[PDB]
Amino acid sequence: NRREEILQSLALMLESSDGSQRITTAKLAASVGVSEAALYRHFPSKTRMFDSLIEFIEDSLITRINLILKDEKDTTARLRLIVLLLLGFGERNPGLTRILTGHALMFEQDRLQGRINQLFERIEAQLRQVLREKRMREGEGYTTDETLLASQILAFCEGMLSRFVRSEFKYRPTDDFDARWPLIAAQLQ
Amino acid sequence: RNRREEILQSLALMLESSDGSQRITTAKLAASVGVSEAALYRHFPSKTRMFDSLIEFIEDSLITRINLILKDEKDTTARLRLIVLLLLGFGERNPGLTRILTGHALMFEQDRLQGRINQLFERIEAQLRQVLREKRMREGEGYTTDETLLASQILAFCEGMLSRFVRSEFKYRPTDDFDARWPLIAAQLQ
Amino acid sequence: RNRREEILQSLALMLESSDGSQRITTAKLAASVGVSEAALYRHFPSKTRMFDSLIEFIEDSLITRINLILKDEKDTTARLRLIVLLLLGFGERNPGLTRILTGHALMFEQDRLQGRINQLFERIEAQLRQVLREKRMREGEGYTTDETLLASQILAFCEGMLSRFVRSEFKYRPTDDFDARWPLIAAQLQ
C-alpha cells in the first residue's frame, strides 16, 4: 500500500534528472510526503527498496518473454519480439533502465548489481534457448555458436539501453527498430 | 609531472580495482598516492578536473589511434573492424577508464563530466559515420542502410560490450571471440 | 522551539564568551549544545542562517523598542536619550550579539550578513534622523547643524561605545557613566 507508494516515487526520481545523482532517504521521504523515520517502517534499508524494483523489472520481463514463446513459433520472430521488448520496457521505464544499466546501483551495495546480472544471464539463456531450437523447428540450426549469438544480440540491447541512460533519454531505444532489425537478423547465421 | 601524472594513474588503478565500484574519496586517493589531500590540490583545483584529465586522456588515445587506423588502412570494412577492435581493446586494458567511459564512475561526480563522455561518443560515432559514407567514393557502391543508423548500430554493440565488461567486474573480456564476432557485425553493413 | 532556540542561544553564549573572538565552528557549536553537528542542520539549513535569525532577533528588539520610545515620549531630547540608552543598554545585556553589531562576528561569515547589519544601523539612524527634524514642529526652533550630520554624530558615539565594549573584552560596559555622558551629548544638540 504505502510501501507501493514509496517505490512508485523512487521510480519517478530515478527517471527525473535527479536520477543522474544520488537518491538519499531524505529527499525520497520529501518526494513521498512522509518522514524518513516512517520510510524505515516499510524497509529495513535503502537496498531493500531497489530489491523490490529489481523484482518488478525481472517479473515484468520474464513474464512478457514467456508469453512471446507461446504467441510466436518462428525463431526469428521470437528473437525480434524479445529484443523489441527489452528496448520497449527500457523506453517506457527510464528510471528502471538506470537500474538495468547499473548506474542507479552505484550508490547501493554491490549485491544489487549481482541480481541484475542474474536477470541478464537469465534473459540471455532464453535467447540462447530460442536459438538452440531453430534446429528442431526448422531443421537447420546456426553455423555460429548460440552462446555467441545470444550475447551478440544481448550486447546490442545493453548498448541501446546504456546509450539511453547516457543521453538522458534523448536516444530512445525502439527508435528505428524496424530499420535496425534487418541488421540484427543478418547476424543470425 | 612526478606527482600530477602519477596522481591520475593512481586514480585509474583505483578505478580499475574494486574501489572503482564506489565513490573515490580524496582521502583514499591521496593515501593510495602516498601524499596528503592538500598535496592533491597542489596539482588540481578539484577532483572534478582530475576526471576531466582522465577523460581527455581517453579522448586522445581513441581519436589518435583511430586517425592512425584511417591512414594505415584504406578498406572501409577493415577500418570499421579495427576501430571496433580498438574500442573493445582499449576498454579491456583500461578497466578503470572504462568505468568512466560506461558512465558508472561519473555517477559520484559532476553531471558535466558525463556530458563530455557524450561528446566523445558522438566524436567516435561521427568518425564511424564518416568512414561508412566514404565507401561509395572509394568503392563506388554505398550502403543501403542509412549511415547514421549503421554507425549507431556499430557503436551500440561497442557500448554494450563495455557496459557488460563492467557489470561482470571485468570478467567478460570485450575482445574475447572478436574474430568470431566480427563476421556477425560485418553482415550488418548492408 | 526547544532545540531551535536552545542552539541560537548557545550561539550567543559562545559569541559573548572569549571564544567569540574566534570563528564559531559547527564542531564547537554542536559540542557546546551537547549534540552532533548533524542535529544542527536538523534545525538549520546553513550556519549562515543561524546568524540570519540572530540578526533578526537584534532588529526585532531594537526597531521595536525604538517605535515605542517615539510613541511614549514626545520630547525631542528625551527621545534621543532613551534611544542612546537603549542601544548602549542592549549591547551591554547582550555582549555576544554586540559582536554582530560591531561586525566582528560577521568577519568569519558571509559578506551579506554585514550588509544586513548595515541596514539595521541605517534604520536606527533613520528614526534617529527624524526625531530631530521634528524640532521645528513642537519647539518652533531648529538645529544649526544638518540633521544628517548629527544623527550620524550620535550614532557614531554609540558605535564607538559598542566597539570599545567588544575591543576591551567587555570591560568598558557601554552604559557606565551614562548619566554623566548624556549631558555631553546634549551639548551637541545645537
Added chain:
Amino acid sequence: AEKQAKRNRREEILQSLALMLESSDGSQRITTAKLAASVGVSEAALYRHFPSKTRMFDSLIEFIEDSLITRINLILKDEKDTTARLRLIVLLLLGFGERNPGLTRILTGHALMFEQDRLQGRINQLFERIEAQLRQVLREKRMREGEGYTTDETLLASQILAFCEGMLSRFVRSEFKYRPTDDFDARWPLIAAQLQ
C-alpha cells in the same frame, strides 16, 4: 647592500597586505597563499621575510603605532592652545584612518579577527595611549588657562575617543563609504561643545 635588498621584497609584501586589507576583499581573510600570489612568489619563499603572518601585522601596526605617536608628539610642541591640540589629535585619527583604509580594519580590530588575539591587545595599548595623551591635554588646561573642565578629564577623553572609534567603525563597516574626515569642519563644533 644585501640587507637593503631584504626589505625591497619584504616591505613590498606589506604594501600588498595593506593594499588587500584596503580593497573590497578586506572584509574576508587574508591567507598566505593568496598573498604570495600578489607579491609574485611562493609561501615558503615568504617565511624568509616573516617567521609568520602575525609578525606581518606587527610591523604593520608599528607603522600606525609610530605614525600617530609621532604626529601627536609634534602637534603638542607646535601648538599651545588646549582645544586646538584636541581638534588636531582628533583629526589625526580621522585623517590617518581615511588615508589608510586597509590599516583601519586593523584599528577597528576586524582584520585582526583571523590572526592572534595578542594583536588586538597591542591595538588596545595604542588606544589607551592616544586616550591618556588626550587626557593630558585636558588636564593641562588648568595650568595654562586658569580653569579646567567641569566634567572628569577621564570621561571627556573617552567621550572623544569613542566618537573616533565610532567614525572609523562606520568607515570600515560601510565598506569605506563613510569618509571620517568628511564634514569634520562642521562636526568639530559639536565635539568641542562637549568640552565643558
Added chain:
DNA sequence: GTGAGTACTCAC
C-alpha cells in the same frame, strides 16, 4: 537524532 564521512582550506 548520529558516526563516519565528504571535497576542499590553511598557515607553517
Added chain:
DNA sequence: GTGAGTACTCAC
C-alpha cells in the same frame, strides 16, 4: 609538502 581543520552530508 602537511596535520588539523571547515561547513555540510548521509543511511539509518
